[PDB]
Design a binder for this molecule. Structure first.
Ligand SMILES: NC(=O)c1ccc[n+]([C@@H]2O[C@H](COP(=O)([O-])OP(=O)(O)OC[C@H]3O[C@@H](n4cnc5c(N)ncnc54)[C@H](O)[C@@H]3O)[C@@H](O)[C@H]2O)c1
Ligand SMILES: O=P(O)(O)OC[C@H]1O[C@@H](O)[C@H](O)[C@@H](O)[C@@H]1O
Ligand SMILES: [Mn+2]
Length: 436
């Protein structure tokens, strides 16, 4: 029409019902002919697929829908792969959080030792799906929000350098939404921003409206008193941005920087017996990964309780920009190679890009200050050592990765944490030499 064929890898997730829903709302600006679900376990996806099946029939029945665990069925004749796989699922996420916490160290999905562990699990999963895409639809793009994006992006850069995969993250979008609310704008798309960093590790340097008016002084005065909370708890993520932002008053921070600049505050935010993976399993998981069972039985929308995930509109914005060559400016994770002049050219950086049908065209950042440089060189080193550990099957390189982390207080605690993660992750990591 032109209409696009899409496969969601990680169909038995609890995000997918929310995004099929969002994909249906965005059908005018991004039309679909085929939507397939891919997962390795049939019975999780089937039960998700039954509710998606109902949605598709209500709003756009002429879309071909199928759920499958067979790679060839899934990845043949698609234009885009939307990947949100979680190797090890929430059970491993729980351990990623809890193991470090036992030692007084930040326990978090993508930051600190929990992030490194998840990274080690994820690399293999993402490479698997990417190879299926290249084997069955060589010209499709993979839009990967499968975390932790910084480590996975470094893996693909090294191990699959020519592949059409874009690693992406919704945090900046979420923060920009709150910025737009603070400024009285109808939408974040009314702002034109400059930004640099690593994934979950960056700064806005310039924010203006379409006319070129500077919005930054207004945002800074607000954020320096309230964080990213619109006018209407010191350690809540968005409130806490106020403390992070004072480290560098000329910019505005990614909220994830709290885990690095105030690690010991964050250690005590999580219940060590009942972490965020447990708050997600009660809140969502069994909530929707079996209100889908009702929607399948009924075979209707109920005035349904599963909300439209309007936060995942950014994945559709990206697919659109590639499909119709819109040239929209978006923050993506790409190989630096000069975008940040005075930073490792081989690093994956999160920077504004003009997105078109050939992929992103990164915009130059120029020279960055010493504060951000130092922080980013340390952190990228953690991510690069983690990928080296994975590719070389090296225990030593992984230990070095933990030693380097700003969240880890010393090399002995680094080793203790590593020995515990090795044990917890035996089914999901490659076997490491020297000497687990
Ligand atoms: N980068 C971002 O901005 C961002 C934002 C939100 C969520 N996420 C990521 O989205 C993913 C999904 O999150 P969720 O909360 O819905 O988790 P989830 O466990 O509900 O979804 C994961 C699904 O992936 C499937 N899966 C796991 N390993 C697989 C494999 N090897 N092959 C095929 N399928 C596999 C699992 O069966 C599960 O159904 C996670 O990686 C999460 O970190 C990323
Ligand atoms: O704890 P959750 O509800 O799973 O949130 C975790 C998610 O937060 C988002 O804002 C980040 O951009 C994702 O990278 C992350 O995976
Ligand atoms: Mn993210």
């Amino acid at each position: 029409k032109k209409s696009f064929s899409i496969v969601i890898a990680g169909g038995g997730s609890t995000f997918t019902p929310g995004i099929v829903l969002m994909l249906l709302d965005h059908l005018e600006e991004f039309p679909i002919r085929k939507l397939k679900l891919y997962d390795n376990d049939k019975e999780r996806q089937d039960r998700i697929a039954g509710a998606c099946d109902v949605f598709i029939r209500e709003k756009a029945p002429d879309i071909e829908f199928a759920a499958t665990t067979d790679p060839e069925e899934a990845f043949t004749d698609v234009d885009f792969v939307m990947a949100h796989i979680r190797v090890g699922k929430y059970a491993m996420r729980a351990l990623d959080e809890q193991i470090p916490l036992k030692y007084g160290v930040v326990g978090q999905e993508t930051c600190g030792p929990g992030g490194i562990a998840y990274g080690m699990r994820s690399i293999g999963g993402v490479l698997e799906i990417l190879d299926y895409m290249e084997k069955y639809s060589p010209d499709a793009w993979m839009l990967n929000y499968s975390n932790p994006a910084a480590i996975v992006a470094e893996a693909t850069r090294r191990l699959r350098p020519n592949s059409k995969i874009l690693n992406i993250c919704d945090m900046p979008v979420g923060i920009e939404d709150r910025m737009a609310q603070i400024l009285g704008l109808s939408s974040r798309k009314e702002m034109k921003v400059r930004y640099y960093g690593l994934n979950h590790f960056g700064w806005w340097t310039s924010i203006q409206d379409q006319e070129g008016n500077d919005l930054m002084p207004k945002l800074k005065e607000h954020v320096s008193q309230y964080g990213y909370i619109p006018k209407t708890s010191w350690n809540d993520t968005f409130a806490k941005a106020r403390d992070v932002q004072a480290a560098d008053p000329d910019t505005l921070p990614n909220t994830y920087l709290q885990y690095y600049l105030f690690p010991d505050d964050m250690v005590k935010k999580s219940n060590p017996n009942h972490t965020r993976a447990n708050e997600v399993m009660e809140g969502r998981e069994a909530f929707i990964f079996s209100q889908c069972d009702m929607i399948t039985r009924e075979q209707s929308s109920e005035n349904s309780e599963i909300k439209i995930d309007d936060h995942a509109s950014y994945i559709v914005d990206l697919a659109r920009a590639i499909a119709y060559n819109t040239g929209e400016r978006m923050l993506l994770i790409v190989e630096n190679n000069g975008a940040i002049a005075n930073f490792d050219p081989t690093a994956m950086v999160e920077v504004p890009c003009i997105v078109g049908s050939n992929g992103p065209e990164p915009i130059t950042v120029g020279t960055i200050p010493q504060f951000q440089k130092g922080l980013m060189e340390q952190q990228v080193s953690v991510e690069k050592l983690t990928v080296e550990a994975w590719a070389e099957k090296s225990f030593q390189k992984l230990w070095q990765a933990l030693i380097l982390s700003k969240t880890v207080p010393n090399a002995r605690v680094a080793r203790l944490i590593l020995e515990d993660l090795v044990e917890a992750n035996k089914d999901f990591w490659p076997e490491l030499d020297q000497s687990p």
